[PDB]
Amino acid sequence: PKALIVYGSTTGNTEYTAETIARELADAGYEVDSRDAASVEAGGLFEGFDLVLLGCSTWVDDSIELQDDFIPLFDSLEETGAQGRKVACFGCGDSSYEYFCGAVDAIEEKLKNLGAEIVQDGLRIDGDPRAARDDIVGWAHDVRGAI
Ligand SMILES: Cc1cc2nc3c(=O)[nH]c(=O)nc-3n(C[C@H](O)[C@H](O)[C@H](O)COP(=O)(O)O)c2cc1C
C-alpha cells in the first residue's frame, strides 16, 4: 500500500512526529511519501494513495489556529481527492492552552465534511514528541490495522 504523510511544523515537533510514523509504516511494508505542507500543491494531491496522514501544530489565534504552512492546503482540501479516502490526523500542541491540539479537530471535521473516511481518532501530542515515541509508534500500528 502507498501512504502520503503531509505535515506543517514550525519548531520541528510535528515534523519529527511525521518522520516517526513514516518509519513505522515503512518497516511494516508500505511505500511512504512524506512531504512538508510548504511544498505541496492541493490539486489532486491525494490521487493514487491508499492512506493519507495529515498533521499540524496549533497556534493560538483569533481567526485560524493552524500552523501557517498548512493553511493553504487546509483552505483547498476540497480539491485534494479526499472523498472516500482513508485518512488519519496527528499534531503536537500543549495542554496549557485551551484549544489543546485544536488543529487536529479542525482538520478531522473538514475531512469528514468532504466525505473522507477517518480510520482512527487523531494522535494529539502534549509537549516533546521525542518523549511520546511509544504513543506515536503504537498509533501508527493501530492505523495500519484499520486499513
Ligand atoms: C505562541 C504559541 C502559541 C501556541 N498555541 C497553542 C495552542 O493554541 N494549542 C496547543 O495545543 N498548543 C499551542 N502551542 C504549543 C505548540 O503547538 C507546540 O509547541 C508544538 O509542539 C509545536 O509544534 P511544531 O514544532 O511541529 O510547529 C503554542 C506554542 C506557542 C509558542
Curated annotation (Swiss-Prot):
Keyword Electron transport: yes
Coiled coil, from the record: none
PROSITE patterns to which the protein is assigned, alphabetical: FLAVODOXIN (PS00201), FLAVODOXIN_LIKE (PS50902)
Cofactor(s) needed for function: FMN
Keyword annotations: Electron transport, Flavoprotein, FMN, Transport
InterPro entries the record matches: Flav_short, Flavdoxin-like, Flavodoxin, Flavodoxin/NO_synth, Flavodoxin_CS, Flavoprotein-like_sf
UniProt GO molecular function: electron transfer activity; FMN binding
Domain spans labelled Flavodoxin-like: 3-144
NCBIfam families on file: flav_short
Family: Belongs to the flavodoxin family.
Reported function: Low-potential electron donor to a number of redox enzymes.
Protein name as it appears in the record: Flavodoxin
Annotated organism of origin: Nitratidesulfovibrio vulgaris (strain ATCC 29579 / DSM 644 / CCUG 34227 / NCIMB 8303 / VKM B-1760 / Hildenborough) (Desulfovibrio vulgaris)
